[PDB]
Paper text:
All the MazF toxins from the family are RNases, capable of cleaving various types of RNA including mRNA, tRNA, or rRNA. Here we report crystal structures of MazF-mt3 in its apo form and in complex with the C-terminal half of MazE-mt3.
We next crystallized and solved the apo structure of MazF-mt3 at 3.3 Å, using the alphafold 2-predicted structure as the search model for the molecular replacement. There are 12 MazF-mt3 monomers present in the asymmetric unit (ASU), assembling into six dimers. Most chains resolved nearly all the residues except for an internal proline-rich loop of a 9-residue length between β1 and β2. The two monomers were closely associated with each other and were also very similar in structure (a 0.4 Å RMSD over 105 Cαs). Each subunit displays a typical MazF fold, featuring a central antiparallel β-sheet composed of six strands. On the other hand, Arg110′ and Val111′ of α3′ form an intersubunit hydrogen bond with Tyr35 and Ser32, respectively. These interactions contribute to the stabilization of the dimer interface of MazF-mt3 and may be protein-specific because the residues involved are not conserved in the homologs.
Author numbering:
A (entry chain G): 1 to 13, 23 to 114
B (entry chain A): -1 to 13, 23 to 114
Write the structure that this text describes.
Amino acid sequence: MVISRAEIYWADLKRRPVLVIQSDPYNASRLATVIAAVITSNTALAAMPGNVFLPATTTRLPRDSVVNVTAIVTLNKTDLTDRVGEVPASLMHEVDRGLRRVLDL
Amino acid sequence: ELMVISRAEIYWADLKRRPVLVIQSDPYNASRLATVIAAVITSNTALAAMPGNVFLPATTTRLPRDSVVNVTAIVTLNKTDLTDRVGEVPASLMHEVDRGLRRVLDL
């Protein structure tokens, strides 16, 4: 399947949701890996600076979620199973700013 | 083995004990955050051809051998997992690492 940035997938880390943050050039390349940020259902992590709150109406996920930009994982592209949906441009911009903040970029 | 978890520093960690380069910003490094984000450092210098990766001489890092920062291999470790500190990456090579990270993460 086609792996794109800003997309949410289910993956085995247990089975949790992740947001693809690897750029689409590397996603389309022959690179076996894909970098992603973990999405938690514990909304209390939204207080942590840089993390991004995602309503369940936005992600088509069961519950409200939070992108934890301090929890970055490198997965095999094969580990990505069902796709959940996509994060809108505005919230993805918030995620980008959080990532630049936590990574000094 | 307490030291100070600072950016641009190289540590040994169990991912298999391998070296990692801290890329998490120092505000989060000083915070109570249990995790620390790092890029894996390989001794396979052939990965220096991969775009974005950064070659690190052993004279610069005080590492056993010449190494390469693989900016496509990013791991989130517990601050406790960082054991012996190896040294620090100069500002110029860390800037190259930053550019590679911005490229692979569209930042």
